[PDB]
Amino acid sequence: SDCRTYGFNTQIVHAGQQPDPSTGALSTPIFQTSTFVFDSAEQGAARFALEESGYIYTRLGNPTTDALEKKLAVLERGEAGLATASGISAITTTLLTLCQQGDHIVSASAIYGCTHAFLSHSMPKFGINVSFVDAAKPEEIRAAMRPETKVVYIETPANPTLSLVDIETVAGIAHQQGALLVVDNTFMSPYCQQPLQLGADIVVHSVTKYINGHGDVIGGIIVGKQEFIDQARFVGLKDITGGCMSPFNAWLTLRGVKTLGIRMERHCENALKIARFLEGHPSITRVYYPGLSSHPQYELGQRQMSLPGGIISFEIAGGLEAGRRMINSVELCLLAVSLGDTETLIQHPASMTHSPYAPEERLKAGITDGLIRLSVGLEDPEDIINDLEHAIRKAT
Amino acid sequence: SDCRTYGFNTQIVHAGQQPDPSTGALSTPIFQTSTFVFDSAEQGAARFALEESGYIYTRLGNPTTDALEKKLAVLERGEAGLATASGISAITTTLLTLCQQGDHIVSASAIYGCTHAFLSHSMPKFGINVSFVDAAKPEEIRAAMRPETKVVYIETPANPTLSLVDIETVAGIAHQQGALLVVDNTFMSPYCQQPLQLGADIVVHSVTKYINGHGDVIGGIIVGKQEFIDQARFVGLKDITGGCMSPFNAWLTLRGVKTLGIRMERHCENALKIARFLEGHPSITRVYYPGLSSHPQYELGQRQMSLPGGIISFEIAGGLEAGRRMINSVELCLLAVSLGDTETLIQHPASMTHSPYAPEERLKAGITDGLIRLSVGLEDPEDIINDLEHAIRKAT
Amino acid sequence: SDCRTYGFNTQIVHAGQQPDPSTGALSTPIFQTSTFVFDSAEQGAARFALEESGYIYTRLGNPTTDALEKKLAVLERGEAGLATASGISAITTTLLTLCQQGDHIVSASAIYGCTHAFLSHSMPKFGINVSFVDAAKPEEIRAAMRPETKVVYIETPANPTLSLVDIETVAGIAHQQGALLVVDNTFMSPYCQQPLQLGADIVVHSVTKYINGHGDVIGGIIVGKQEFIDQARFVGLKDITGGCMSPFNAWLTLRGVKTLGIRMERHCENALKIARFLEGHPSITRVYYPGLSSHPQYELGQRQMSLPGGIISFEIAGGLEAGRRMINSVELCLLAVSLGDTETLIQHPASMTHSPYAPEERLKAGITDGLIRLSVGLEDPEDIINDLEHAIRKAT
Amino acid sequence: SDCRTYGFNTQIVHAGQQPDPSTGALSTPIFQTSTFVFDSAEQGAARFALEESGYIYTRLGNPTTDALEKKLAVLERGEAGLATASGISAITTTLLTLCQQGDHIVSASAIYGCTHAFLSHSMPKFGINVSFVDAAKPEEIRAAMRPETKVVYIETPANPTLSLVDIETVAGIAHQQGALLVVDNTFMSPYCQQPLQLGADIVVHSVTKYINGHGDVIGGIIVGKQEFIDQARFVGLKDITGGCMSPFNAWLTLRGVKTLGIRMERHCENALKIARFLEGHPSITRVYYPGLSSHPQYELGQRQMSLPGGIISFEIAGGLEAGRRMINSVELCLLAVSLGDTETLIQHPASMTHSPYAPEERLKAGITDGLIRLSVGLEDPEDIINDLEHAIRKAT
Ligand SMILES: *Cc1c(COP(=O)(O)O)cnc(C)c1O
Ligand SMILES: *Cc1c(COP(=O)(O)O)cnc(C)c1O
Ligand SMILES: *Cc1c(COP(=O)(O)O)cnc(C)c1O
Ligand SMILES: *Cc1c(COP(=O)(O)O)cnc(C)c1O
């Protein structure tokens, strides 16, 4: 049969995978090899000429990684996938394949910090200019487009305030002006949002977050048309970034993604409960969560996202010192800077990642002094709420 | 004590490593994690401000990978190391950290094919121009230097004819003209050649070859001054290539490198025997091996290399068809395109990697129709010789 | 705090685990080591004398495996855990620690086939006699008890007809007669049944099934009182079976168990839907599933099990040939002999595992000619039902 | 061709292994699976009936582990191999397959401590009696034989004094009296001693030591006739010990064994240098090493062993307190209780493993107060000697 025909949970479990043909092994074997052996000179030449399918060398391609690439292509409804060493490598392999000196990119300003650093500081040194705009306002995207614009780049939801971008509307604007739309879908995973179905051309993820979900893999994935992915593989990865994924990391990500549907359901069920608790707490001034009807783009989120996500941000009364006291008072939530793990993770940017920055520079990343970012895990939500209540009460 | 004080075999085993402090575990633990947890807001801020040692997130740094980086820095007599997703990523993370639009690179022409593709086709699209020269002639390096030249880039020995480059002489030329010298030391490993001791500024390796040695890791390493490595880590890797190494791959490379000294001794003992056998064979027109006194740069090799290496190239009588017949007639040597594995690997480029290319285009990579490339493994050399003799006899 | 105080999902995620003390790594490091190093002669002696905590050698104990042992002890409400190379090793390490020549065991007859082979053929050759009884009838257990009986051994539910054993009632009988009760809890996992809370003394699992859940680990676990577990570790494992678990297998099982709660919820939701579909199908003569009210011990199952499980057996009309045709006609369910994986697995014992046996010998394992065993996975239940309907329709 | 025809180093690299048939991957894939899938009911039945080759379930057999089993069978010149969870499991799976209540074993007294504990305390509780003899005196073996003796069990060399057993002579005695000879060949590895070639029936190893060689695997192997190995697999392992090896551990051992020849050569070259240094040191009363001509069985060792090994024991002047001071004064040698790793390991049993024992009880394991045991690693021997000289000088 064809796995593209089954339901989404069935695809999560099975797409891109099948029992090993020589042994019947059910788990995808870990092809932890660099070298592949040819049966003859002619078989080697046939593979190098693309006249025969098969493998050559793990930087170019590998059976374990191929399974992950095919699975994620199915889940995003794209033609082809390309696994990478990190989410950053997925982003930069994509953009360095597409762009050359003299080209231009229109990017959302509300993007992952290291992506912003790449676009702000590294791209212009290669002659590739970037204009940053508020992508919640599609007119600002249009106004920033130039004859040289090759790419519009967006993230949605966008940390740390969980604002949204209207993918379908932005895709139409980008395409009318001759540009590709690249969407970083890390926050949602394909279980909750499908940018290619809304007109995006390329989707990138850090699999480090929800796709792997177990806090033990750094990796990325790119999904798009075969013609583009082939260039991203044989030029961007092979020559430019060298950012190939280890077969063992691909195997762990295949293993983690098996539970993506059930994990996202529980992350989001837990997060909605915690978000409602925080919205009712008189020591919490604001709660940013797409599942609360007061979210400024709530209706867009309901049309574009099948679930409101596992991430919450909120502001605690009392600013910087209260946020520091609160984060130093949790006993179950763990202080860390990643997200999408099975454990609940918490961070206070103004006292952690952005401490030696001026308050007006911190807002440039949307960071207020009392802002706390919470990645909701798979624990009992009552335990998470009790921990938050205990810490908030102490802090205020 | 200080491991930088012990003998080289002792350093191979011990440098960069020690029993785990919390448990005493002798093997370096596999810190297969993405996330690291802070004990307090203040500890997180201290790490982000570089005011406290410790870890944050595996793309930035990891204890397992740190051990590999420190070991390879000791072995190359460099200050610091940076592990990468691939040898290509080591090369491009280095050059994309050092160079920006308007800069220039002087490169040897006799370099790894994918490095050549990066330099020929990708660098100029970022405004970084490259002049290729015959680096066996240091005067051609000097003549190609421009005010904008930031880097001279060399490999030695250089596949597929095993020609050499005089590292010390080229380093002096590069430095007099204000450029850094980057040496790809993959072929030799630090056990056989130490470019930093001869004046190079930066050494890169594909650990995929001899350093790991077991044919099961794609990876790279960069070694140089702390100031440069810090930029390669926090800009080149973090932002540009995203080419971080998986902790499991670092652990496998640590494990492989434990036997680097004994492996290189056996590879080179075997290769010298096989090279002498081939040089005495009337069906073999030429043998390229630094350990044969007829090698055109033999004396330079004796001063610069402690052993002549594990790689041999040779030309079989009868050109393309004889090379194809020979490679299709081996029974022990394995047909493949990597090198530095414990198994003997063999390839015939004119019928394998470069078949759909014109004979005059193949020479542009030094490839004649009868040229065979042999990576000598750890088998009994008598068995390798018998296999080669059987195949040569059949082919001719 | 104490993790034994949190909710069960919180314990699944966190019990037995914490950030690495020397680095903060969130994932439990893979301590893939044999050797541990002492700081002094005195520290080595202190560990060998049990006068100091810490590690010596991985066969005796290991930090990664210790985390798994502690987690499973928390989840089963037992004092201590011991990980093993396989479920069989958990069973035999337990029984060979407890029993010596002249001792006796009363065992259920409806037990895992290889356990039955150990008890029937291997135990008596060591002078340890075994009486098999129908453990659904607690009076048969009582009647089989002898002065030499050390252990009553049961599984519940019991494959392949999913009959039950009343743990609390059997525990009272065993204890009144001076014997320990050992329960194999593999089928249910601690998420669905807690034998120690009902009076059992020792729980064993094959973690190969639901606890790991990902079809990529063979392993076992024993949970019980510290005094017994210490004997199982330092005599049974150290000396008798040698069945220690690899640190990597323990790490994978820790990783798999993170999703145990959400997996069991989905397995059982899916299984109840499929069981009801099969019970309404006129080509299916019988359906064995604890969640159907027609199950002969339905009310006991509701008191003893929090969910009815992920396993279903059923009889297809037409006996042996229909069962063979049906199993050869599924397109999504995979033909295999394990259970508890994320993929739906199916087997027809009369044509697969028990084909060269007489029909009257097959019933001795409860196997009728039309009996099919289904391990329900995490796919969309509609897809599983459609596959079963297609295959049943073709077969009948 | 047939790998049993190549030289021993070629076999170390290649025996039991070949490129993956479906992909050409050179490294043996890690078949980290529990479940295997059948294409039809008939294929499942054919495998269960042994009428078709192939896999069923990893406890029974696995492609990665099969490669290791076949390689070690080739290296020991035996018919078949069986991998296990530990060296202890190799020993007990063997003996519990061969023996039942009423049987008898004649064992050397100079054996590994946990093997001695199994034979002394556990075997008799299963009705299997054991007589311990000085196996350096073959007449004591003969005199201890009884009508019920099934097995003669020996280790050679034997820790901690490195005494020897004449394998060929003992095999002839055992066979004349109708018993099998089992030899634990862990100390030597097949590179240095081949008991089956000298008449032994079964060889066991802890692969934890030299075969893996990297201090990161606990595991065992059994090698013998196909008829016996089949019983050890399908009864001893399947039913009794459950001591199967994890596929990942088998893959690591395959990887470690690739360098067995070059490692043993260097271990033994280093050990002979260190042994000669110790024999010339006036603070060292005795040196136990088969490569010193003063060894009491030196000539037997030269006939039976191709190299004298990597292990040395020696007595330091001043007894218990000097041994403790010496071991607390090394800076490079690591204090630990395993052997065969790439790092040099050292232990002082009288102050470490046997401290709370009476001096007359310590001699029962051949342990004098000043006895030090050294596992010589791959470091520069000059560095090891300097470390030992520094520590000896301080201690005396
Ligand atoms: C973490 C993250 C990234 C970067 O991925 P890495 O795997 O850390 O390189 C990119 N985008 C988003 C939205 C992320 O959360
Ligand atoms: C193989 C090789 C490389 C590339 O390294 P990868 O690990 O394949 O990316 C670079 N230089 C040399 C000399 C090589 O042999
Ligand atoms: C599979 C199973 C076992 C055996 O465990 P292994 O890990 O295969 O050794 C024991 N009991 C039950 C109920 C099982 O399903
Ligand atoms: C270490 C050893 C063993 C035991 O093997 P494990 O892998 O630790 O179970 C048995 N025999 C000898 C000679 C050993 O050195």
CATH of the domain at C312: 3.90.1150.10
Instruction: Measure CA C391 to chain center.
Output: 30
Asked whether the beta carbons of D87 and D204 are under 8 A apart, the reply is yes
How many Å lie between the centroid of ligand 2 and the Cα of residue B87? 5
Count the residues in chain D: 396
Instruction: Please measure the distance between the N-terminal and C-terminal CA atoms of chain A and give it in whole angstroms.
Output: 59
Asked whether the beta carbons of A305 and A291 are under 8 A apart, the reply is no
Whether residue D59 is annotated as binding a ligand: the answer is: yes
* Strand-pair category, D202-206 with C180-184: unpaired
Closest to A225 measured CA to CA, from A90, A95, A83, A80: A80
Bridge partners for D30 per DSSP = A30
d(CA D145, CA D106): 7
Asked whether the beta carbons of D198 and D168 are under 8 A apart, the reply is yes
Atom 7 of ligand 2, residue of closest alpha carbon: B87
Please provide residue B148's backbone torsions phi and psi, each rounded to the nearest 5 degrees. Answer: -90, 0
Please tell me if residue C263 touches chain A, with a CB cutoff of 8 Å: yes
Count the residues in chain C: 396
- The CATH number for A171's domain is 3.40.640.10
Structure determined by: X-ray
Are C229 and C288 part of one and the same domain? no
Determine whether A356 is exposed, middle or buried from the number of CB atoms within 10 Å of its CB (0-12, 13-18, 19+).
exposed
Note whether residue B55 is domain-resident. yes
Atom 1 of ligand 4, residue of closest alpha carbon: D206
How many Å lie between the centroid of ligand 2 and the Cα of residue B367? 18
The answer to whether the CB atoms of B378 and D258 lie below 8 A apart is yes
Maximum pairwise Cα distance, chain B: 74
Looking at B260, B288, B317, the residue that finishes a domain is B260
The answer to whether the Cα torsion of D325, D327, D333, D335 is positive or negative is negative
Cis peptide before B19 (omega within 30 of 0): no
Please provide residue B282's backbone torsions phi and psi, each rounded to the nearest 5 degrees. Answer: -70, -10
Cβ of D94 closer than 6 Å to ligand 4, yes or no, is no
Note whether residue B344 is domain-resident. yes
Residue C216: closest CA among chain A residues belongs to which residue?
A: A27
What lies within 8 Å, CB to CB, of B99 at 6+ separation is B105, B123, B128, B150, B151
A34: nearest CB among B34, B35, B338 = B338
Note whether residue D40 is domain-resident. yes
**Residue C223 parent element (H or E):** strand C220-224
Sheet holding A104-108, edge to edge: A80-84, A220-224, A202-206, A180-184, A149-155, A104-108, A129-133
Please tell me if residue D352 touches chain A, with a CB cutoff of 8 Å: no
Ligand 2 nearest-atom number relative to CA B115: 10
Instruction: Please measure the distance between the N-terminal and C-terminal CA atoms of chain B and give it in whole angstroms.
Output: 59
- Looking at the structure of chain B, the number of domains it has is 2
Pick from D239, D321, D351, D369 the residue to mutate for testing the C interface (most C CBs within 10 Å). D239
Asked whether the beta carbons of C381 and C344 are under 8 A apart, the reply is no
Atom 4 of ligand 2, residue of closest alpha carbon: B87
Cβ of C209 closer than 6 Å to ligand 3, yes or no, is yes
Please tell me if residue D352 touches chain B, with a CB cutoff of 8 Å: no
Side chain identity at A348, as an amino acid letter?
Answer: H
d(CA C345, CA C335): 6
Q: Give me D282's structure tokens.
A: 């006036």
d(CA A358, CA C370): 74
**3-state DSSP call for residue C285?**
strand
Instruction: Measure CA B391 to chain center.
Output: 30
Q: Where are the alpha helices (DSSP H) in chain C?
A: 8-14, 41-48, 63-76, 87-98, 113-117, 138-144, 167-176, 226-231, 247-257, 260-279, 298-304, 319-327, 359-363, 381-395
If one counts every other C-beta atom within 10 angstroms of the C-beta of residue A36, the result is: 30
C55 is catalytic: no
Closest to B309 measured CA to CA, from B392, B170, B220, B185: B185
d(CA B97, CA B231): 7
Atom 7 of ligand 4, residue of closest alpha carbon: D87
Whether residue B88 is annotated as binding a ligand: the answer is: yes
Burial A116-153 (b: 16+ CB within 10 A, else e): bbbbeebbebbbbbbbbbebbebebbbebbeeebbbbb
Are C316 and C233 part of one and the same domain? no
Bridge partners for D132 per DSSP = D107
Chains in contact with D, counting 3 or more C-beta pairs less than 8 Å apart as contact: A, B, C
Range of the domain at A233: 6-260
Whether residue D146 is annotated as binding a ligand: the answer is: no
A214: nearest CB among C8, C216, C255 = C255
Are B165 and B276 part of one and the same domain? no
Residues 239-258 of B with CB under 8 A from C: 251
The answer to whether the CB atoms of C218 and D337 lie below 8 A apart is no
For chain C, how are helix, strand and coil distributed in percent, rounded to 5? Answer: 40, 15, 40
B100: nearest CB among A86, A125, A218 = A125
Asked whether the beta carbons of A311 and A186 are under 8 A apart, the reply is no
Maximum pairwise Cα distance, chain C: 74
d(CA D257, CA D28): 13
DSSP-derived secondary structure for C327-371? HTT-SSSEE-S--SSSS-EEE-TTTTTTTTS-HHHHHTTT--TTE
Note whether residue A1 is domain-resident. no
Catalytic machinery residues of B:
59, 112, 184, 209
Please tell me if residue A20 touches chain D, with a CB cutoff of 8 Å: yes
Q: What does DSSP assign to residue C217?
A: -
d(CA C157, CA A234): 54
Are D247 and D269 part of one and the same domain? no
Asked whether the beta carbons of D197 and D75 are under 8 A apart, the reply is no
Cβ of A112 closer than 6 Å to ligand 1, yes or no, is yes
Asked whether the beta carbons of A212 and A183 are under 8 A apart, the reply is no
d(CA B160, CA A31): 28
Q: Give me A84's structure tokens.
A: 């990478």
Residues 355-394 of C with CB under 8 A from D: 355-356
Helix axes C247-257, C63-76, angle to 10 degrees: 40
What lies within 8 Å, CB to CB, of A207 at 6+ separation is A83, A87, A217, A219, A220, A221, A253
Q: What does DSSP assign to residue C232?
A: I
Are A255 and A267 part of one and the same domain? no
Asked whether the beta carbons of B340 and B321 are under 8 A apart, the reply is no
How many Å lie between the centroid of ligand 1 and the Cα of residue A5? 30
Are B318 and B177 part of one and the same domain? no
- C242: closest CA of chain D, how far (Å): 4
Secondary structure string (H, E, C) spanning D90-114: HHHHHHHHHCCCCCEEEEECCCCHH
Pick from A22, A35, A40 the residue to mutate for testing the D interface (most D CBs within 10 Å). A22
For chain D, how are helix, strand and coil distributed in percent, rounded to 5? Answer: 40, 15, 40
Cβ of C301 closer than 6 Å to ligand 3, yes or no, is no
Torsion from C-alpha of D354, D359, D363, D364, nearest 10 degrees: -80
Asked whether the beta carbons of C148 and C124 are under 8 A apart, the reply is no
Side chain identity at A134, as an amino acid letter?
Answer: D
d(CA D106, CA D121): 15
Note whether residue B1 is domain-resident. no
Please provide residue A105's backbone torsions phi and psi, each rounded to the nearest 5 degrees. Answer: -130, 135
If one counts every other C-beta atom within 10 angstroms of the C-beta of residue C118, the result is: 24
**Residue A298 parent element (H or E):** helix A298-304
Chains in contact with A, counting 3 or more C-beta pairs less than 8 Å apart as contact: B, C, D
Q: How far is CA D298 from CA A337, B136, D168, D206, D307, in A?
A: 63, 56, 16, 25, 12
Count the residues in chain A: 396
Chains in contact with C, counting 3 or more C-beta pairs less than 8 Å apart as contact: A, B, D
DSSP-derived secondary structure for C302-322? HHH-SS--SEEEEEETTHHHH
Note whether residue D175 is domain-resident. yes
Q: Which ligand is nearest to the CA of B94?
A: 2
Are B349 and B229 part of one and the same domain? no
Cβ of B315 closer than 6 Å to ligand 2, yes or no, is no
Note whether residue C180 is domain-resident. yes
Q: Where are the alpha helices (DSSP H) in chain B?
A: 8-14, 41-48, 63-76, 87-98, 113-117, 138-144, 167-176, 226-231, 247-257, 260-279, 298-304, 319-327, 359-363, 381-395
Q: Which region, left, alpha or beta, applies to residue A14 given φ > 0 means left and ψ of -120 to 50 means alpha? A: alpha
- CA angle (B206, B207, B210) in 5-degree steps: 105
Are D317 and D342 part of one and the same domain? yes
Determine whether A171 is exposed, middle or buried from the number of CB atoms within 10 Å of its CB (0-12, 13-18, 19+).
buried
- B346: closest CA of chain C, how far (Å): 34
Are B18 and B135 part of one and the same domain? yes
d(CA B83, CA B94): 11
Are C211 and C289 part of one and the same domain? no
Q: Give me D257's structure tokens.
A: 């064994």
> Tokens 């260097």 identify what position?
D266
- CA angle (B111, B113, B115) in 5-degree steps: 70
Whether residue C210 is annotated as binding a ligand: the answer is: no
Are B230 and B362 part of one and the same domain? no
How many Å lie between the centroid of ligand 4 and the Cα of residue D27? 27
Chain B residues with CB under 8 Å of C37 CB are 19, 24-26
How many Å lie between the centroid of ligand 1 and the Cα of residue A296? 25
Q: Which ligand is nearest to the CA of A189?
A: 1
Asked whether the beta carbons of C331 and C340 are under 8 A apart, the reply is no
Asked whether the beta carbons of B361 and B233 are under 8 A apart, the reply is no
d(CA A60, CA A50): 12
Q: Give me B392's structure tokens.
A: 């040569």
Looking at C260, C277, C309, the residue that finishes a domain is C260
Burial B254-274 (b: 16+ CB within 10 A, else e): bbbbbbbbbbbbbbbebbbbb
What lies within 8 Å, CB to CB, of D66 at 6+ separation is D16
Cβ of A387 closer than 6 Å to ligand 1, yes or no, is no
Closest to D41 measured CA to CA, from B321, C330, B271: C330
What lies within 8 Å, CB to CB, of C320 at 6+ separation is C350, C351, C369, C370
Looking at A219, A234, A260, the residue that finishes a domain is A260
How many Å lie between the centroid of ligand 4 and the Cα of residue D121? 18
Are A245 and A307 part of one and the same domain? no
Discontinuities after residues in chain B (C–N over 2.5 A): none
d(CA D349, CA D111): 15
Side chain identity at C198, as an amino acid letter?
Answer: L
d(CA A3, CA A274): 36
Please tell me if residue B54 touches chain C, with a CB cutoff of 8 Å: yes
Q: What does DSSP assign to residue D151?
A: E
Q: What are the DSSP E strand ranges found in chain A? A: 80-84, 104-108, 129-133, 149-155, 180-184, 202-206, 220-224, 284-288, 311-316, 334-335, 345-347, 371-375
